[PDB]
Amino acid sequence: TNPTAFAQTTRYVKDSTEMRTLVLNLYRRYLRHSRGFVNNYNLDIPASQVRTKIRQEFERQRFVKDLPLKNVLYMKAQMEFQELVNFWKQQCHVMQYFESIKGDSFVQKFLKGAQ
C-alpha cells in the first residue's frame, strides 16, 4: 500500500500552539495553488478572485475555541485541500462552490408565505 498525493496521518494534536502553526502553513498552501485552481477547473473568476474567496473562507471561522474541535476542523479542511489539489471534485462542484449567495420586512414575508 502506498498513500496518495498530499496525504497526512490523522493525528490527535495535544497542543494549542502547534495547531496554530499548522493552520498558518495550510492557508499559504491554498494561496500557492491559486493559479492552478483557475487553470485546473477552468473557473470564470481570475486568480485574485479565488484568493479573495479563500480569504473569505479562512477569515470566516478563525474564532473557534475547542481544541478537540480544532483538530476536527483541521482534519476535514485537509481533506478539502487534498480533494481539490488532486483534482477530484468535478468542474461543476467548484463552480457552484463560489456561486452560492439582506432580508425583508414582515409585510413582505407575510404576503408571499414567509417560511
Binding site: 468535478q90 468542474q91 461543476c92 462542484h93
Partner: protein
Amino acid sequence: YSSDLPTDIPVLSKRPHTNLLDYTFTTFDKMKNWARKSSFWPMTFGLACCAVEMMHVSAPRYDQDRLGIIFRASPRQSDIMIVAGTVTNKMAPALRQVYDQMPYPRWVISMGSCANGGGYYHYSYSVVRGVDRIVPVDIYVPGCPPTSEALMYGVFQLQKKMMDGQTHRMWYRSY
C-alpha cells in the same frame, strides 16, 4: 405589408405527400432513418443490477447483433445511451459529460426503475430520483430489472419512432 396565411393546412406528421418533391424528401428520410434504425449502436453504460439484463440481450438466446445492434464503448461511436441502473448524485455530473459528447442525432433509453423515477432508492440521500432530471429520455423501460425481452420491446418502440422521422421533409414543408 401583404400577408395571407391559410388555416386548414395540417401539421407535418399528418400532412400527406402531394407533389413529387414530397415523395423525394420522404425517400431521403426513410433511407436515412433506415440506416439509423438498423445500425443501432448503444453505449455500454451499465451501472447496477439492470446491467445484467443488458448483457443477456447480447447473449446467444436473444442476440442483439442479429438486429444490427453493436455496443460501442466510446460516446463518439455510439448514437444511443441505455442508462441502466441507479444514477447516484456522485455520478450525475459525470453522466452529463458522457451524454453531451454524443454527436447528433442522439437518443437516450432509461431502463429499469432506478433510471426512470428513483426506484427502490427513491428516498436515499445520494440517489438521483430519476435520470430525467439530468438527460432527456426518449423511452422508459419499466422493470426491476426489466426482462431481456422488455428491453428489446423498448428498443423496438424507439426504432418505430426513428422510422417516423421526417427531417428532410420538414425542411421542404415546415421550414
